[PDB]
């Protein structure tokens, strides 16, 4: 958990302008969070990037999880191997607000983070699921009570988040 160059936003929430895949490789955190869908199909965005960095081992493992357990619920999670990225990957499903899932489920999604003392994570629902990222950060801050290190790759967004949260 050798996190470097983060800016503390609140007593437990930290942020860096960085690629989560590169952070995971440098730090090999205990837990990296994936922003997943309910069937754990890692076809793009952060999920696609994390899976690619595992050379598809994450996807094969995820398919086996679904074979045993069925799909996750929106706002739910499961813990699988982190392979070369982390000890564990916490796959968390935020709401797909652009397909009508309730934004209030973003609180339930972030509540999964509280099962782990320290996490490297992206913002949830802030890619193609369509939630405003600043809103997603505000829910993170209000909900997570463990120590979360957020990697935000887009500097334009990072600068807006730091401006809004100090």
Numbering used by the authors: 4 to 169
Please share text taken word for word from the publication where this structure appeared.
The large, multidomain Nsp3 includes an ADP-ribose phosphatase domain (ADRP/MacroD), which is believed to interfere with the host immune response by removing ADP-ribose from ADP-ribosylated proteins or RNA. The well defined substrate-binding pocket is created by the C-terminal edges of the central β-strands β3, β5, β6 and β7 and the surrounding fragments, primarily loop β3–α2, the N-terminus of helix α1 and a long loop connecting β6 to α5, which contains the short 310-helix η3.
The ADRP–MES crystals also belonged to space group P21, but with a smaller unit cell and with only one protein molecule in the asymmetric unit. These crystals diffracted to 1.07 Å resolution. Two MES molecules were identified in the structure: one in the ADPr-binding pocket and another on the protein surface. The ADRP–MES complex, however, presents a somewhat different scenario, in which the 2-N-morpholine ring takes the place of the proximal ribose and a sulfonic acid substitutes for the distal phosphate. The latter group forms the hydrogen bonds observed in the ADPr complex and an additional network of solvent-facilitated contacts. The ring moiety appears to primarily be anchored by hydrophobic interactions with Phe132 and Ile131, and a hydrogen bond might potentially be present between the morpholine O atom and Asn40, although the geometry is rather unfavourable. The apo and AMP-bound forms contain the η3 element within the β6–α5 linker, while in the ADPr and MES complexes this region does not observe 310-helix parameters. With the R2 pocket empty or containing MES, Ile131 adopts the pt rotamer (p, plus, centred near +60°; t, trans, centred near 180°), while in the presence of a ribose ring it converts to the mt state (m, minus, centred near −60°). In the ADRP-APO2 and ADRP–MES structures, the last hydrogen bond is replaced by an interaction with the carbonyl group of Gly47, enhancing the proton-abstraction capabilities of the environment.
